[PDB]
Amino acid sequence: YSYTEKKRIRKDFGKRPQVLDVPYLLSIQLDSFQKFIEQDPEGQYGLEAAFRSVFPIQSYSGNSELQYVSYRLGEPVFDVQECQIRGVTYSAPLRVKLRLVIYEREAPEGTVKDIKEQEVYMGEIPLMTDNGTFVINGTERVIVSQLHRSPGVFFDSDKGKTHSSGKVLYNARIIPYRGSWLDFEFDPKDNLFVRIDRRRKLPATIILRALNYTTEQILDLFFEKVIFEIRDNKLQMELVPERLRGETASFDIEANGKVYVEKGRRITARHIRQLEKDDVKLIEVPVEYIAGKVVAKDYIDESTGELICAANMELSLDLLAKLSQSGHKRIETLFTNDLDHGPYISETLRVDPTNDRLSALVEIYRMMRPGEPPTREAAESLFENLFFSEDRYDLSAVGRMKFNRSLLREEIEGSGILSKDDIIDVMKKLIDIRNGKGEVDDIDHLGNRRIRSVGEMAENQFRVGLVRVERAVKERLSLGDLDTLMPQDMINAKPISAAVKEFFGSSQLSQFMDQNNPLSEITHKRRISALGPGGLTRERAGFEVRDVHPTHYGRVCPIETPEGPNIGLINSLSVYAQTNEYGFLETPYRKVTDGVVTDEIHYLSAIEEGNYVIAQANSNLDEEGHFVEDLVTCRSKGESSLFSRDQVDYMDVSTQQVVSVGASLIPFLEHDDANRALMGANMQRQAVPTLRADKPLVGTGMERAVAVDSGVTAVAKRGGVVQYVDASRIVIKVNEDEMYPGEAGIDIYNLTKYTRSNQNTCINQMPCVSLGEPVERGDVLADGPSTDLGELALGQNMRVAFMPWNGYNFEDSILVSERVVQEDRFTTIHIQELACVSRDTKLGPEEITADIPNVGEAALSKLDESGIVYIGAEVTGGDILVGKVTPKGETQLTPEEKLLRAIFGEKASDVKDSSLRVPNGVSGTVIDVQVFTRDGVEKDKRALEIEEMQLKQAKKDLSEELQILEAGLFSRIRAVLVAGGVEAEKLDKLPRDRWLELGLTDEEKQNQLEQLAEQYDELKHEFEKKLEAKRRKITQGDDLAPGVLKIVKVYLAVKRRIQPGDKMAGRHGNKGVISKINPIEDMPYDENGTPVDIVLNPLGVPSRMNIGQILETHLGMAAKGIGDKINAMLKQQQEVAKLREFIQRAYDLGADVRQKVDLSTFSDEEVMRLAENLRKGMPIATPVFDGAKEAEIKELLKLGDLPTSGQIRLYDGRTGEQFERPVTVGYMYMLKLNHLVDDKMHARSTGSYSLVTQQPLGGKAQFGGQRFGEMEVWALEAYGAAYTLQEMLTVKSDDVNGRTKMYKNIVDGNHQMEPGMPESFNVLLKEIRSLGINIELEDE
């Protein structure tokens, strides 16, 4: 194993040999945004796609144009951390090259009139960290992938809209990437109709006229031919046999001389078959059969030139006469099978009043621009703009793909613009589905739903900015001068950066990151939603989208989605998933060939999956043969079933890919219900890190890669030897081979100490290593807030036993010991931030100074010179942090205090206090202060003491850096002289600088002397430039608001501990609030006196079925026991060999354990440290659905010399006796939560009041009154407490006379009530009277 694995191994009972190892988890953010930047020449992605798709642009007249060239980005001015500290966006410059080519409208296109090829900055752009956040005003923020109906086309059918009909109505819809929608539909009367974007209904055929088709060409396209021949008097006609199918003979249908079908007889498939086999196509028939048939195409007499029948008109017998007399012994007609080939289009034509292309354009123009006097090109241009202009309609070649496949083309690609072939093919497949062939499609299938990551949205808003530019570009091109108006004398970068900024800071997807837990971060990045733009709404959407669809398998976790109104909408991504290039999804599958499971992989998409047949990972493979058992669990078609062995196409990879990470971590999930796992994995994200990092024993194996891939830890970039160690930084020297030749290869890592999280928690780092040891590359060099040796640790493992206790664990509540509290182990941190702003007023500036009137030296004892707190303080409500004061106005006084300062002579200044203080209820420890000030105002002294010290710190931190880096170099400057003789001790003893004068020679060594001269020169010089830019970055003032003169900021530390009310839980939904802490003596305990830490009520196990905690508990009791054995082996201090035997005997225990590890490979001290790190408990991996078994649990517990049932006689402590029976016992891994009473509790006597209604507020942050809803009125209406009601209606809320009067009657003792009138009432009267109404009262 690896080094960070050698020291603390996690056992495994997984058996399924994994072919694959997990991927990098945060790949999608990186790759998406990368495509948004990455300089694609041809297969345009994001930026270049927007420039190409928009530029070039030419004038409003047609003479001048701007031309795209290329782009380039600057490195950002500010690094990451100054952007965190300052409250500043992290972002990089943008620079586009632009060429103003202009054309003479004198010359035809004599382009050489003007060229201005210059460069333009416009707009910053935020960038992505190595981990995925975007820093914005000093806030780490995350922006979330979206999921929505892909572009293309989508067919549907509502069942009984007119429920009186009880009838089916089919419809089709076209939905592009950009541009307008399009709806096709049927009616009860079987008439095709159109509406655009849901404008009004229109007879569909109108559009086809507008598309320059005649009724002839239309019916040629839609209707197949039925050809008659009037052979000299009588009617014969051509007939394919499968035309009279399920059809009934109207006449005696006979043949050459032969009767197939009689009158009143069905043309059975027998007679279709005789009509087929007999080579019979022509049949003699009655003329009367025609009458009712419709002509297909216009017929005249070549003598007349007159329509004997216009096209699409019903035939007769006088028209059979007159046609054949006019020279028609051929009459093509329209096939019409009301069953299969319906008269939809023709009826729609007979309803359609429009005859020409033009009027069709007019009535479209009238649908969308109602009223307006129509004109030709307004309407032609309108229609052609809608779906035939590149500007206002683009499909996304994605959309072109899906569309084409929906029409069964071969062409993936095409245009973002429609063609008439496309429209009419859609109408054809529509009516085809109206006949019965094919099917409507479904929403909930993933193959209709497309992911939209960051870079695509950024592309969108970027282009919108380009339009905001483009209007004024043209207005300023055609009008203003050409040769002199530079390209950037037109450009304004404000709409662009305003757009990018707007999206990064106002959209629903843009939001603060959940920093309470690395798990919560990574899963907040692996989030997927259908809301936001191009999406849905809670009040609108229903259950269908919320529910699962079987294609979620291997792509979306069904186990992680909230319990509130967002139950189905939000959902998280699965583990081995990826994205289709188009935006759809895919998932790995092992290909199954000849029964042999092929170890290659293919990423089947949302749609390929159902067509093949797919097997499970549960399959007990026949050892590189095939599936052992005949009836193999496989699936296809959107359902599972049992199939054969050689018959298979594909297999799942692992036993996991259905899941997300969170539910990949809950062990013994297979022994649990989905509801309580939902709640477990949800609350698994709301954890808080403990003060320490206590690992879990019951594992899954994914813990490590999550502890790494959050990026929170240090990572060995290039493995090597630990050079320097500290509590704040680490230095490693890089291995020689890994050391690139140019660079010295000495990596250094600066670590983060106690620092605020966005949820006000402790962020911190610590080395998981010693000094002077090799490092395998990729190891963890530093742990974080919730990690240990490279594994996650959200909480702490401890002793548990299931029984009631005197009512203290009544309904899921918890009882807990004192011993836990003495070990601080659930104690946690809540760093906080507080600020004070120095403003400029109408009267003068606010001033930060120690001096404040009417203050005692008690408070002031801790403010330094400038009126600022010394670091190290420990403070409480009422204390003062920053003495700020404000020049004051003046006062209209009362006679009394006037007399009182006429007595004492005391006075005010012309100034008021505005200090920064602790808010009531709070206490804690000041540990850091920061100050920001304008470039232009004096730095208040302490600021100089801060920034100068920030240079003492900084320039030291760099001196060290350069001193080490350069000191290594200073070997060269020693040795290089020494090549070319030797000064064996004349070199060393005399001072090191003066060796250049020692042993010297000609040809090659003078260049050497001056090479060292260069080295010296460089080495000081780089320092000086470093120092220059660095020091000015420290000293340069701050970009603040107007009126804001300087700011202070104060960071605290508060150390909150467990109390009744502080919720806790585990990883199965096994919630619980605390009701008491129990002394060690009143606890239950055992024969050996080791008491319990936590007690639980198993009433709530069976009905909740969260059974894994039981098995987990058993296993925990096992693991600790082994550690206890080893602990006995250490204090008794046995020997190497006994540890060797015992440990290797412990690893090789399970039935068919996948992993096999030997210890003779390891050396002695490895055995030592590993036995020493296991003594608290041997940690184990229970993969989620490849779990362990009762045989293995109980085998292990027998190795522990414990009761196999894990269930022991307990003795009560208060009474000293035994209980009746045994009780289950063992170790749960358990957690604390942010839902702490310290942050929830709130009271209110009397305080603030609002502004319009004057009734109090809500929220503890605003000293809020609690709401008394209508329900809570209806109750008192039930009882009859009119007085309690009136009390809550007048004095506590609105009646100001009442509240003041009441306070005064109280302090006089009197508990007496007077009412007034609520102000919101008379407010309402005033409003109504504003609405033009004489509302008024009938005074008594």
Residues 1097-1136 that bind other proteins (CB under 8 A): 1097-1100, 1102-1103, 1105, 1107
Q: Exactly one of 1136, 1273, 1317, 1335 binds other proteins (CB under 8 A); which one? A: 1273
Nearer to other proteins, 989 or 1267 (CB): 1267
Q: Exactly one of 39, 508, 611, 959 binds other proteins (CB under 8 A); which one? A: 508
Binding span for other proteins by CB under 8 A among 193-201, 308-316, 591-599, 1273-1281: 1273-1281
Nearer to other proteins, 1080 or 1313 (CB): 1313
> Any contact of residue 1320 with other proteins (CB under 8 A)?
yes
Nearer to other proteins, 166 or 564 (CB): 564
Nearer to other proteins, 189 or 1033 (CB): 1033
Nearer to other proteins, 649 or 673 (CB): 673
> Any contact of residue 372 with other proteins (CB under 8 A)?
no
Nearer to other proteins, 400 or 645 (CB): 645
Q: What is the DSSP letter of 1266?
A: P
Nearer to other proteins, 47 or 615 (CB): 615
As a whole number of angstroms, the distance between CA 340 and CA 1155 comes to 64
As a whole number of angstroms, the distance between CA 597 and CA 590 comes to 7
> Any contact of residue 807 with other proteins (CB under 8 A)?
yes
Q: Calculate the alpha carbon distances from 251 to 245, 264, 976, 1035 in Å.
A: 16, 7, 116, 105
Q: Exactly one of 282, 674, 727, 1128 binds other proteins (CB under 8 A); which one? A: 674
Range 809-838, binding other proteins (CB under 8 A) = 810-813, 837
Each as own residue / partner, the long-range contacts of residues 216-219 (CB below 8 Å, 24 or more positions apart, any chain) are 216/297, 216/298, 216/311, 218/345, 218/349, 219/296, 219/297, 219/311, 219/312, 219/334, 219/345, 219/346
Q: 38-77 mask for other proteins (x: CB under 8 A)?
A: ----------------------------------------
Pairing assessment for the beta strands 585-593 and 578-579 based on DSSP bridges:
antiparallel
Range 144-183, binding other proteins (CB under 8 A) = none
Binding span for other proteins by CB under 8 A among 15-23, 174-182, 790-798, 1306-1314: 1306-1314
Q: Name the burial class of residue 869, with classes exposed (0-12), middle (13-18) and buried (19+) by CB atoms within 10 angstroms of its CB.
A: buried
Residue 1258 bridge partners (DSSP): none
Q: 92-131 mask for other proteins (x: CB under 8 A)?
A: -x-x------------------------xx----------
Nearer to other proteins, 509 or 973 (CB): 509
- Sign of torsion, CA 450 453 456 460? positive
Total residues interacting with other proteins, rule: CB under 8 A: 152
Q: Exactly one of 168, 621, 1146, 1289 binds other proteins (CB under 8 A); which one? A: 1289
As a whole number of angstroms, the distance between CA 557 and CA 548 comes to 10
Q: Calculate the alpha carbon distances from 226 to 256, 264, 347, 655, 1335 in Å.
A: 20, 22, 18, 60, 78
> Any contact of residue 1095 with other proteins (CB under 8 A)?
no
Q: 453-492 mask for other proteins (x: CB under 8 A)?
A: -----------------------------------xx-xx
Q: 1173-1212 mask for other proteins (x: CB under 8 A)?
A: ------------x-x-------------------------
3-class state of residue 552 by DSSP: helix
3-class state of residue 512 by DSSP: strand
Nearer to other proteins, 904 or 994 (CB): 904
Residue whose token pair is 């990470």: 661
Residue 126 bridge partners (DSSP): 91
Range 250-289, binding other proteins (CB under 8 A) = none
> Any contact of residue 1324 with other proteins (CB under 8 A)?
yes
Smallest separation (angstroms) from other proteins to the CB of 839: 8
Instruction: Give the helix/strand (H/E) hosting 272.
Output: helix 269-277
Nearer to other proteins, 625 or 878 (CB): 878
Residues 6+ apart with CB under 8 A from 976: 1008, 1011, 1012
Smallest separation (angstroms) from other proteins to the CB of 198: 15
Q: Name the burial class of residue 1075, with classes exposed (0-12), middle (13-18) and buried (19+) by CB atoms within 10 angstroms of its CB.
A: middle
Residue type, 368: M
Range 539-578, binding other proteins (CB under 8 A) = 543, 546-549, 553, 558-559, 561, 563-565, 567-568
Neighbours of 645 (CB within 10 A): 20
Q: What is the DSSP letter of 694?
A: P
Range 859-918, binding other proteins (CB under 8 A) = 878
Nearer to other proteins, 342 or 562 (CB): 562
Q: Exactly one of 1274, 1336, 1337, 1338 binds other proteins (CB under 8 A); which one? A: 1274
Nearer to other proteins, 32 or 1290 (CB): 1290
Range 595-624, binding other proteins (CB under 8 A) = 616-618
> Any contact of residue 856 with other proteins (CB under 8 A)?
no
Smallest separation (angstroms) from other proteins to the CB of 1042: 4
Q: What is the DSSP letter of 605?
A: E
Each as own residue / partner, the long-range contacts of residues 1261-1265 (CB below 8 Å, 24 or more positions apart, any chain) are 1265/1292, 1265/1293
Q: Which two tokens mark 1204?
A: 């196999």
As a whole number of angstroms, the distance between CA 178 and CA 387 comes to 10
Of residues 362, 396, 356, 352, the one with CA closest to residue 382: 362
Range 1211-1240, binding other proteins (CB under 8 A) = 1217, 1235, 1237-1238, 1240
Q: Calculate the alpha carbon distances from 9 to 647, 790, 1134 in Å.
A: 41, 11, 22
Nearer to other proteins, 173 or 1292 (CB): 1292
> Any contact of residue 1322 with other proteins (CB under 8 A)?
no
Q: Name the burial class of residue 86, with classes exposed (0-12), middle (13-18) and buried (19+) by CB atoms within 10 angstroms of its CB.
A: middle
Smallest separation (angstroms) from other proteins to the CB of 1101: 8
> Any contact of residue 1296 with other proteins (CB under 8 A)?
yes
Q: Name the burial class of residue 693, with classes exposed (0-12), middle (13-18) and buried (19+) by CB atoms within 10 angstroms of its CB.
A: buried
Q: Exactly one of 1309, 1334, 1336, 1337 binds other proteins (CB under 8 A); which one? A: 1309
Q: 1020-1059 mask for other proteins (x: CB under 8 A)?
A: ---------------------xxxx--------------x
Binding span for other proteins by CB under 8 A among 267-275, 475-483, 715-723, 1067-1075: 1067-1075
Q: Which phi and psi (to 5°) does residue 1215 adopt?
A: -110, -15
Nearer to other proteins, 501 or 733 (CB): 501
Smallest separation (angstroms) from other proteins to the CB of 1271: 4
Between helix 941-978 and helix 1005-1035 the angle, nearest 10°, is: 170
> Any contact of residue 806 with other proteins (CB under 8 A)?
yes
Nearer to other proteins, 293 or 1114 (CB): 1114
> Any contact of residue 1268 with other proteins (CB under 8 A)?
yes
> Any contact of residue 440 with other proteins (CB under 8 A)?
no
SS (H, E, C) 1272-1335: HHHHHHHHCCHHHHHHHHHCCCCCHHHHHHHHHHHHCCCCCCCCCCCHHHHHHHHHHHHCCCCC
Q: What angle do CA 394, 395, 398 make, to 5 degrees?
A: 140
Residues 6+ apart with CB under 8 A from 124: 89, 91, 92, 93, 94, 497, 500
Binding span for other proteins by CB under 8 A among 419-427, 787-795, 885-893, 1299-1307: 1299-1307
Smallest separation (angstroms) from other proteins to the CB of 760: 19
